[PDB]
Design a protein around this motif. Structure first.
Motif, PDB file in Angstrom:
ATOM      1  N   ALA A  17       0.806  -1.359   0.040  1.00  0.00           N
ATOM      2  CA  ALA A  17      -0.027   0.020  -0.090  1.00  0.00           C
ATOM      3  C   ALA A  17       0.927   1.417   0.058  1.00  0.00           C
ATOM      4  CB  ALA A  17      -0.928   0.046   1.276  1.00  0.00           C
ATOM      5  N   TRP A  18       2.161   1.246   0.190  1.00  0.00           N
ATOM      6  CA  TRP A  18       2.970   2.502   0.147  1.00  0.00           C
ATOM      7  C   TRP A  18       2.708   3.236  -1.388  1.00  0.00           C
ATOM      8  CZ3 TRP A  18       8.335   3.457  -2.246  1.00  0.00           C
ATOM      9  CH2 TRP A  18       8.628   4.632  -1.795  1.00  0.00           C
ATOM     10  N   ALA A  19       2.434   4.457  -0.986  1.00  0.00           N
ATOM     11  CA  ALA A  19       2.204   5.510  -2.309  1.00  0.00           C
ATOM     12  C   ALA A  19       3.409   6.116  -2.965  1.00  0.00           C
ATOM     13  CB  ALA A  19       0.947   6.565  -1.837  1.00  0.00           C
ATOM     14  N   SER A  59      11.932   7.930 -14.784  1.00  0.00           N
ATOM     15  CA  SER A  59      11.149   7.000 -15.723  1.00  0.00           C
ATOM     16  C   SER A  59      11.870   5.838 -15.212  1.00  0.00           C
ATOM     17  CB  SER A  59      11.494   7.037 -17.151  1.00  0.00           C
ATOM     18  OG  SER A  59      10.865   8.463 -17.614  1.00  0.00           O
ATOM     19  N   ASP A  60      11.092   4.741 -14.608  1.00  0.00           N
ATOM     20  CA  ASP A  60      11.754   3.667 -13.979  1.00  0.00           C
ATOM     21  C   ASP A  60      11.127   1.990 -14.857  1.00  0.00           C
ATOM     22  OD1 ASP A  60      13.173   5.142 -12.215  1.00  0.00           O
ATOM     23  OD2 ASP A  60      11.222   5.372 -10.980  1.00  0.00           O
ATOM     24  N   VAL A  61      12.181   1.258 -14.693  1.00  0.00           N
ATOM     25  CA  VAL A  61      11.813  -0.211 -14.949  1.00  0.00           C
ATOM     26  C   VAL A  61      12.593  -1.199 -13.884  1.00  0.00           C
ATOM     27  CG1 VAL A  61      11.805  -2.361 -16.567  1.00  0.00           C
ATOM     28  CG2 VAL A  61      11.127   0.157 -17.090  1.00  0.00           C
ATOM     29  N   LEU A 112      13.243  -4.232 -10.628  1.00  0.00           N
ATOM     30  CA  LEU A 112      12.909  -5.652  -9.930  1.00  0.00           C
ATOM     31  C   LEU A 112      13.312  -5.561  -8.436  1.00  0.00           C
ATOM     32  CD1 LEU A 112      15.119  -7.779 -12.252  1.00  0.00           C
ATOM     33  CD2 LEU A 112      12.846  -7.090 -12.695  1.00  0.00           C
ATOM     34  N   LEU A 113      12.062  -5.963  -7.967  1.00  0.00           N
ATOM     35  CA  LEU A 113      12.320  -5.681  -6.162  1.00  0.00           C
ATOM     36  C   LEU A 113      11.748  -6.908  -5.540  1.00  0.00           C
ATOM     37  CD1 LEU A 113      12.796  -3.695  -3.886  1.00  0.00           C
ATOM     38  CD2 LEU A 113      10.359  -3.093  -4.045  1.00  0.00           C
ATOM     39  N   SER A 114      12.597  -7.595  -4.607  1.00  0.00           N
ATOM     40  CA  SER A 114      12.180  -8.691  -4.013  1.00  0.00           C
ATOM     41  C   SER A 114      10.827  -8.453  -3.004  1.00  0.00           C
ATOM     42  CB  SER A 114      13.334  -9.337  -3.050  1.00  0.00           C
ATOM     43  OG  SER A 114      13.587  -8.457  -2.006  1.00  0.00           O
ATOM     44  N   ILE A 161      17.022  -4.469  -8.275  1.00  0.00           N
ATOM     45  CA  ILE A 161      18.149  -4.413  -9.581  1.00  0.00           C
ATOM     46  C   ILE A 161      17.178  -3.403 -10.490  1.00  0.00           C
ATOM     47  CG2 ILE A 161      18.820  -5.371 -11.748  1.00  0.00           C
ATOM     48  CD1 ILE A 161      18.766  -8.281  -9.943  1.00  0.00           C
ATOM     49  N   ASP A 162      17.768  -2.262 -10.749  1.00  0.00           N
ATOM     50  CA  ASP A 162      17.457  -1.154 -11.640  1.00  0.00           C
ATOM     51  C   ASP A 162      17.459  -1.782 -13.298  1.00  0.00           C
ATOM     52  OD1 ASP A 162      17.261   0.217  -9.519  1.00  0.00           O
ATOM     53  OD2 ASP A 162      18.958   1.536 -10.372  1.00  0.00           O
ATOM     54  N   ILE A 163      16.470  -1.733 -13.928  1.00  0.00           N
ATOM     55  CA  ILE A 163      16.932  -2.011 -15.491  1.00  0.00           C
ATOM     56  C   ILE A 163      16.901  -0.691 -16.068  1.00  0.00           C
ATOM     57  CG2 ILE A 163      16.142  -3.039 -17.512  1.00  0.00           C
ATOM     58  CD1 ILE A 163      14.764  -5.047 -15.407  1.00  0.00           C
ATOM     59  N   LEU A 164      16.032   0.283 -15.889  1.00  0.00           N
ATOM     60  CA  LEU A 164      16.047   1.790 -16.442  1.00  0.00           C
ATOM     61  C   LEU A 164      15.706   2.459 -15.170  1.00  0.00           C
ATOM     62  CD1 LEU A 164      15.916   4.031 -18.713  1.00  0.00           C
ATOM     63  CD2 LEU A 164      13.617   3.408 -19.119  1.00  0.00           C
ATOM     64  N   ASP A 165      16.563   3.448 -14.906  1.00  0.00           N
ATOM     65  CA  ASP A 165      16.103   4.746 -13.991  1.00  0.00           C
ATOM     66  C   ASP A 165      16.631   5.808 -14.648  1.00  0.00           C
ATOM     67  OD1 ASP A 165      15.966   6.379 -11.429  1.00  0.00           O
ATOM     68  OD2 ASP A 165      17.767   5.690 -10.615  1.00  0.00           O
ATOM     69  N   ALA A 166      15.862   6.971 -15.048  1.00  0.00           N
ATOM     70  CA  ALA A 166      16.406   7.990 -15.814  1.00  0.00           C
ATOM     71  C   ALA A 166      15.614   9.213 -15.522  1.00  0.00           C
ATOM     72  CB  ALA A 166      16.436   7.765 -17.426  1.00  0.00           C
ATOM     73  N   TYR A 167      16.164  10.250 -15.484  1.00  0.00           N
ATOM     74  CA  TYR A 167      15.611  11.649 -15.217  1.00  0.00           C
ATOM     75  C   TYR A 167      15.848  12.415 -16.773  1.00  0.00           C
ATOM     76  CZ  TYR A 167      16.379  10.011 -10.808  1.00  0.00           C
ATOM     77  OH  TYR A 167      16.597   8.886  -9.655  1.00  0.00           O
ATOM     78  N   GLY A 168      14.772  12.361 -17.724  1.00  0.00           N
ATOM     79  CA  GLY A 168      14.931  12.691 -19.124  1.00  0.00           C
ATOM     80  C   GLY A 168      14.890  14.314 -19.422  1.00  0.00           C
ATOM     81  N   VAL A 174      21.705   7.438 -18.104  1.00  0.00           N
ATOM     82  CA  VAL A 174      20.812   6.615 -17.453  1.00  0.00           C
ATOM     83  C   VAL A 174      21.508   5.899 -16.201  1.00  0.00           C
ATOM     84  CG1 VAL A 174      19.332   6.133 -19.320  1.00  0.00           C
ATOM     85  CG2 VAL A 174      21.202   4.597 -19.180  1.00  0.00           C
ATOM     86  N   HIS A 175      20.678   5.874 -15.082  1.00  0.00           N
ATOM     87  CA  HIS A 175      21.410   5.116 -13.866  1.00  0.00           C
ATOM     88  C   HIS A 175      21.139   3.813 -13.844  1.00  0.00           C
ATOM     89  CE1 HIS A 175      21.354   4.730  -9.210  1.00  0.00           C
ATOM     90  NE2 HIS A 175      22.423   5.002  -9.972  1.00  0.00           N
ATOM     91  N   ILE A 176      22.353   3.011 -14.041  1.00  0.00           N
ATOM     92  CA  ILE A 176      22.130   1.595 -14.060  1.00  0.00           C
ATOM     93  C   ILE A 176      22.702   1.027 -12.789  1.00  0.00           C
ATOM     94  CG2 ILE A 176      21.765   1.053 -16.681  1.00  0.00           C
ATOM     95  CD1 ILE A 176      24.947   0.964 -16.906  1.00  0.00           C
ATOM     96  N   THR A 230       6.826   5.993 -12.365  1.00  0.00           N
ATOM     97  CA  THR A 230       7.519   7.022 -12.653  1.00  0.00           C
ATOM     98  C   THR A 230       7.513   7.556 -11.077  1.00  0.00           C
ATOM     99  OG1 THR A 230       5.618   8.604 -12.916  1.00  0.00           O
ATOM    100  CG2 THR A 230       6.868   7.449 -15.079  1.00  0.00           C
ATOM    101  N   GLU A 231       8.299   8.197 -10.597  1.00  0.00           N
ATOM    102  CA  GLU A 231       8.409   8.784  -9.230  1.00  0.00           C
ATOM    103  C   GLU A 231       9.034  10.327  -9.357  1.00  0.00           C
ATOM    104  OE1 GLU A 231      11.277   6.076  -7.085  1.00  0.00           O
ATOM    105  OE2 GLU A 231      10.099   4.322  -7.016  1.00  0.00           O
ATOM    106  N   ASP A 232       8.661  10.865  -8.182  1.00  0.00           N
ATOM    107  CA  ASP A 232       9.394  12.180  -7.682  1.00  0.00           C
ATOM    108  C   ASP A 232      10.026  11.690  -6.474  1.00  0.00           C
ATOM    109  OD1 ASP A 232       9.300  14.251  -5.247  1.00  0.00           O
ATOM    110  OD2 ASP A 232       9.500  15.333  -7.434  1.00  0.00           O
TER     111      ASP A 232
END
Ligand SMILES: OC[C@H]1O[C@@H](O)[C@H](O)[C@@H](O[C@@H]2O[C@H]3CO[C@@H]([C@@H]2O)[C@@H]3O[C@@H]2O[C@H](CO)[C@H](O)[C@H](O[C@@H]3O[C@H]4CO[C@@H]([C@@H]3O)[C@@H]4O[C@@H]3O[C@H](CO)[C@H](O)[C@H](O[C@@H]4O[C@H]5CO[C@@H]([C@@H]4O)[C@@H]5O[C@@H]4O[C@H](CO)[C@H](O)[C@H](O[C@@H]5O[C@H]6CO[C@@H]([C@@H]5O)[C@@H]6O)[C@H]4O)[C@H]3O)[C@H]2O)[C@H]1O
Ligand code: NA
Length: 295
Positions: free
Chosen positions: A50-52, A114-116, A118-120, A127-134, A152-154, A249-251
């Motif tokens: 439920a975390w927003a 902009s994020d893709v 993986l999270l246990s 594991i980040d696949i894509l993490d970018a502030y475009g 892009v942050h990997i 996406t995230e702020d």
């Protein structure tokens, strides 16, 4: 055809890459407020609890949709608040090493992430696949944003939850840059998660970074099964836990409320910038997932 594009990672001797039916090319229509069965077979339209979300983020089920061949997610100011409502979806099935995962996506022309990723299930391994502030430009900071628009942050994280502690590698190669402005085109971002100690990152079919070994994956022993964070004893698991696939996406707080307290390091959309919907829409053409098998 997306399923046929060669996999850039190496399956191993007498091995081949086997396409997983949990992959999705988003060719169906899924209305934002009424997703339908095709979406819901593979995805939930929220974060995995439920975390927003972090910073000014307030995730909403109705800020993601699928239309015109893409998964799309956009951002709007929460009425009466500084918070920004935006999308987050989670896979209904988990993945584990050895596995190659690749998204063809178009980073937003926004200061939002902009994020893709993986999270246990237990939030300890990521594991980040894509993490970018475009964004080309930031009105909040009053500055050219090309420091970020070209990176892009990997990366990957291991956490201790209580009390909260976060490790990721921080060497300069964890931000990839070659001159490309990511927001202009779809690109392919992939990761071969080979085993608990070995990650390879791929952009557009090319190996761009290898992160391998205990000293870079978990040097602080946050993954010890007994006494996390104690470097005198070694029961480290590495990145071993099966993981949810998350697209959002995230702020983030370090961007909207920077440490320095300085307006000039404050990167978050203004109301004027949010008036451009296209700039704040993250599009994913597809996400494909392969496992190495014997021939
Ligand atoms: O011209 C300008 C230019 O100048 C140059 O000179 C400068 O260098 C430039 O700046 C540079 O930019 C980078 C280059 O060097 C630095 C410079 O500033 C910089 O490096 C960045 O610096 C920062 C450090 O301050 C950043 O940290 C940044 O890294 C980020 O780190 C994270 C955040 O975003 C990614 C960035 O790398 C990254 O990794 C993940 O990304 C994803 C999204 O893709 C997520 O954000 C994820 O976050 C995690 O998600 C889950 C797992 O753990 C938590 C974490 O947030 C979270 O779990 C939830 O946590 C909450 C509490 O928050 C709850 O616990 C919740 O649990 C639930 O709570 C309730 C409801 O249900 C239950 C359940 O328990 C409960 O009842 C959890 O699930 C990220 O890890 C770094 O690279 C330039 O200025
Ligand atoms: Na598609």
């Amino acid at each position: 055809d997306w399923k046929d594009i060669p996999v850039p990672a190496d399956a191993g001797p007498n091995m081949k890459w086997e396409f997983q039916e949990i992959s999705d090319n988003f060719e169906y229509e899924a209305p934002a407020d009424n997703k339908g069965s095709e979406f819901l077979e593979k995805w939930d339209d929220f974060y995995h609890n439920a975390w927003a979300g972090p910073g000014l983020t307030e995730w909403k089920r109705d800020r993601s949709y699928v239309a015109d061949g893409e998964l799309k997610m956009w951002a709007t100011r929460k009425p009466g608040s500084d918070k920004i409502n935006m999308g987050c979806i989670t896979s209904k099935t988990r993945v584990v090493y050895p596995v190659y995962i690749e998204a063809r996506a178009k980073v937003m022309n926004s200061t939002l992430a902009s994020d893709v990723w993986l999270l246990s299930a237990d939030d300890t391994q990521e594991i980040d696949i894509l993490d970018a502030y475009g964004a080309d430009y930031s009105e909040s900071a009053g500055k050219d944003h090309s420091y970020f628009s070209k990176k892009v942050h990997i990366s990957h994280h291991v956490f201790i939850r209580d009390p909260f502690q976060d490790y990721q590698p921080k060497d300069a190669g964890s931000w990839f840059e070659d001159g490309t402005v990511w927001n202009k085109e779809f690109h392919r971002f992939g990761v071969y998660w080979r085993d608990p100690w070995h990650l390879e990152y791929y952009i557009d079919g090319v190996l761009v970074r290898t992160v391998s070994g205990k000293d870079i994956i978990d040097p602080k022993h946050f993954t010890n099964t007994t006494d996390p964070g104690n470097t005198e004893i070694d029961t480290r698991t590495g990145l071993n836990k099966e993981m949810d696939i998350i697209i959002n996406t995230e702020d983030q707080t370090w961007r909207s409320s920077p440490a320095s307290g300085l307006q000039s390091n404050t990167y978050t959309p203004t109301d004027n910038e949010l008036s451009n919907i296209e700039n704040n829409t993250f599009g994913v053409d597809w996400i494909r997932i392969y496992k190495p098998v014997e021939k």
